Enzyme design. Sequence first.
Site, PDB file in Angstrom:
ATOM      1  N   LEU A  22       0.825  -1.214   0.000  1.00  0.00           N
ATOM      2  CA  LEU A  22       0.000   0.000   0.000  1.00  0.00           C
ATOM      3  C   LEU A  22       0.845   1.243   0.000  1.00  0.00           C
ATOM      4  O   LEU A  22       1.878   1.282   0.685  1.00  0.00           O
ATOM      5  CB  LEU A  22      -0.894  -0.012   1.241  1.00  0.00           C
ATOM      6  CG  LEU A  22      -1.830  -1.201   1.371  1.00  0.00           C
ATOM      7  CD1 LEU A  22      -2.424  -1.218   2.785  1.00  0.00           C
ATOM      8  CD2 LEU A  22      -2.918  -1.194   0.293  1.00  0.00           C
ATOM      9  N   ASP A  65       3.059  -5.804   2.956  1.00  0.00           N
ATOM     10  CA  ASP A  65       3.481  -4.806   3.940  1.00  0.00           C
ATOM     11  C   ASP A  65       4.059  -5.438   5.194  1.00  0.00           C
ATOM     12  O   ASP A  65       4.238  -4.760   6.208  1.00  0.00           O
ATOM     13  CB  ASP A  65       2.272  -3.897   4.257  1.00  0.00           C
ATOM     14  CG  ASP A  65       2.094  -2.862   3.127  1.00  0.00           C
ATOM     15  OD1 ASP A  65       3.016  -2.042   2.963  1.00  0.00           O
ATOM     16  OD2 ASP A  65       1.061  -2.881   2.426  1.00  0.00           O
ATOM     17  N   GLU A  70       5.942  -2.468  13.193  1.00  0.00           N
ATOM     18  CA  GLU A  70       5.469  -1.504  14.161  1.00  0.00           C
ATOM     19  C   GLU A  70       3.966  -1.468  14.224  1.00  0.00           C
ATOM     20  O   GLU A  70       3.397  -1.242  15.274  1.00  0.00           O
ATOM     21  CB  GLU A  70       5.981  -0.104  13.815  1.00  0.00           C
ATOM     22  CG  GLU A  70       5.373   1.018  14.622  1.00  0.00           C
ATOM     23  CD  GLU A  70       6.210   2.275  14.615  1.00  0.00           C
ATOM     24  OE1 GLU A  70       6.207   3.015  13.662  1.00  0.00           O
ATOM     25  OE2 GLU A  70       6.903   2.445  15.676  1.00  0.00           O
ATOM     26  N   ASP A  71       3.323  -1.596  13.055  1.00  0.00           N
ATOM     27  CA  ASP A  71       1.881  -1.347  13.077  1.00  0.00           C
ATOM     28  C   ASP A  71       1.054  -2.457  13.732  1.00  0.00           C
ATOM     29  O   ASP A  71      -0.078  -2.168  14.087  1.00  0.00           O
ATOM     30  CB  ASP A  71       1.361  -1.091  11.657  1.00  0.00           C
ATOM     31  CG  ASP A  71       1.936   0.219  11.115  1.00  0.00           C
ATOM     32  OD1 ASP A  71       1.963   1.217  11.853  1.00  0.00           O
ATOM     33  OD2 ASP A  71       2.404   0.159   9.957  1.00  0.00           O
ATOM     34  N   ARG A  90      -3.526  -6.154   5.870  1.00  0.00           N
ATOM     35  CA  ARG A  90      -2.435  -6.344   6.834  1.00  0.00           C
ATOM     36  C   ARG A  90      -2.844  -7.126   8.068  1.00  0.00           C
ATOM     37  O   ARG A  90      -1.973  -7.409   8.917  1.00  0.00           O
ATOM     38  CB  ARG A  90      -1.861  -4.969   7.213  1.00  0.00           C
ATOM     39  CG  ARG A  90      -1.295  -4.249   6.000  1.00  0.00           C
ATOM     40  CD  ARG A  90      -0.360  -3.069   6.288  1.00  0.00           C
ATOM     41  NE  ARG A  90       0.666  -3.559   7.189  1.00  0.00           N
ATOM     42  CZ  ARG A  90       1.390  -2.844   8.024  1.00  0.00           C
ATOM     43  NH1 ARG A  90       1.315  -1.519   8.023  1.00  0.00           N
ATOM     44  NH2 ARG A  90       2.218  -3.477   8.840  1.00  0.00           N
ATOM     45  N   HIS A 165       0.073   8.371   9.464  1.00  0.00           N
ATOM     46  CA  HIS A 165       0.047   8.111  10.878  1.00  0.00           C
ATOM     47  C   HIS A 165       0.560   9.311  11.687  1.00  0.00           C
ATOM     48  O   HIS A 165       1.262  10.165  11.140  1.00  0.00           O
ATOM     49  CB  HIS A 165       1.005   6.965  11.248  1.00  0.00           C
ATOM     50  CG  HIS A 165       0.656   5.615  10.739  1.00  0.00           C
ATOM     51  ND1 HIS A 165       1.579   4.870  10.022  1.00  0.00           N
ATOM     52  CD2 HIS A 165      -0.491   4.893  10.846  1.00  0.00           C
ATOM     53  CE1 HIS A 165       1.037   3.702   9.706  1.00  0.00           C
ATOM     54  NE2 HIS A 165      -0.223   3.694  10.175  1.00  0.00           N
ATOM     55  N   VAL A 260       6.774   3.595   0.110  1.00  0.00           N
ATOM     56  CA  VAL A 260       5.551   2.908   0.565  1.00  0.00           C
ATOM     57  C   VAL A 260       5.212   3.331   1.986  1.00  0.00           C
ATOM     58  O   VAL A 260       4.603   2.597   2.734  1.00  0.00           O
ATOM     59  CB  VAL A 260       5.667   1.406   0.394  1.00  0.00           C
ATOM     60  CG1 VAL A 260       5.778   1.071  -1.096  1.00  0.00           C
ATOM     61  CG2 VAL A 260       6.853   0.775   1.132  1.00  0.00           C
ATOM     62  N   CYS A 266       9.016   2.140  11.598  1.00  0.00           N
ATOM     63  CA  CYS A 266       8.074   1.163  11.108  1.00  0.00           C
ATOM     64  C   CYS A 266       8.611  -0.268  11.110  1.00  0.00           C
ATOM     65  O   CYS A 266       7.808  -1.224  11.148  1.00  0.00           O
ATOM     66  CB  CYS A 266       7.661   1.530   9.659  1.00  0.00           C
ATOM     67  SG  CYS A 266       9.015   1.433   8.431  1.00  0.00           S
TER      68      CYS A 266
HETATM   69  N1  LIG Z   1       4.705   2.913  11.277  1.00  0.00           N
HETATM   70  C1  LIG Z   1       4.793   3.014   9.974  1.00  0.00           C
HETATM   71  O1  LIG Z   1       5.702   3.789   9.599  1.00  0.00           O
HETATM   72  N2  LIG Z   1       4.026   2.295   9.130  1.00  0.00           N
HETATM   73  C2  LIG Z   1       4.175   2.391   7.683  1.00  0.00           C
HETATM   74  C3  LIG Z   1       3.227   1.443   6.975  1.00  0.00           C
HETATM   75  C4  LIG Z   1       3.348   1.545   5.445  1.00  0.00           C
HETATM   76  C5  LIG Z   1       2.489   0.542   4.708  1.00  0.00           C
HETATM   77  N3  LIG Z   1       2.752   0.579   3.234  1.00  0.00           N
HETATM   78  C6  LIG Z   1       0.993   0.820   4.982  1.00  0.00           C
HETATM   79  O2  LIG Z   1       0.401   1.497   4.138  1.00  0.00           O
HETATM   80  O3  LIG Z   1       0.528   0.337   6.030  1.00  0.00           O
END
Ligand SMILES: NC(=O)NCCC[C@H](N)C(=O)O
EC number: 3.5.3.18
Length: 273
Positions: A22, A65, A70-71, A90, A165, A260, A266
């Site tokens: 994404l 992804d 981190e997410d 995700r 974010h 991205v 992340c």
């Molecule tokens: N904590 C972060 O820096 N997350 C980045 C996530 C990028 C991933 N391409 C997304 O769209 O979730």
Amino acid sequence: TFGRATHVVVRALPESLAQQALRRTKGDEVDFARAERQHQLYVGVLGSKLGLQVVQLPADESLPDCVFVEDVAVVCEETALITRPGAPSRRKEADMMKEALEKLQLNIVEMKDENATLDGGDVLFTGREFFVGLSKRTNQRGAEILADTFKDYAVSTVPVVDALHLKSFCSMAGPNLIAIGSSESAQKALKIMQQMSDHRYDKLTVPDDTAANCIYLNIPSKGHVLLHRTPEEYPESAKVYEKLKDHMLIPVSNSELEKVDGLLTCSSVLINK
Ligand SMILES: NC(=O)NCCC[C@H](N)C(=O)O
């Protein structure tokens, strides 16, 4: 001690990231081989130079992804919140993260509520409190579940309007130091965060909002360490970091994953055991 860590969870890049991850901006194509080198160096700084014990999860090509660990988890002290990411593509990244964090012997809380979403990138933990961005990825119910999970800390929210974010334009740069971008949107968010807290934070203001995303660590025998974007990528923000003679500074390249929307924070989940 704020910023102490002993262990880090990272995850390998899938080949599918280049075309299928994404991204909000449809710009220059990802150079996948170079993205792999940048990740290798990043992991090497954390494990080899700084001595953290690295847990490296394998890539899943069905999860383009999956590098962005981190997410999917927020760790505070001995507790891990396994999130329900905002992006449906995700969500299954949580599976292997939950297993890894179980094996690190953390207390595990899972965000199961089907009306809740939260990306870890929306969470700023200052050591004293949490700030949670309400974004297209993180909603009020997700923030509430975080607050319920980390009951010994105050949790406040801030609108994320013009970025992916909260930590797209801020991060902790030291024990009382919030790195922050200079845009209208980043400054508005900072002022709301500051108004919601009774604690006075110092700020490290940088001209490139995404260069405000950095990693602070407190490492025995090295001290206060800061991983920050390079002068090649953000020369005007590197000049600000370079004035920090009170930190051990480590420039880290990240040009490819920022295509991205991934910044420095992340690609790791830090744990203090
Ligand atoms: N904590 C972060 O820096 N997350 C980045 C996530 C990028 C991933 N391409 C997304 O769209 O979730």
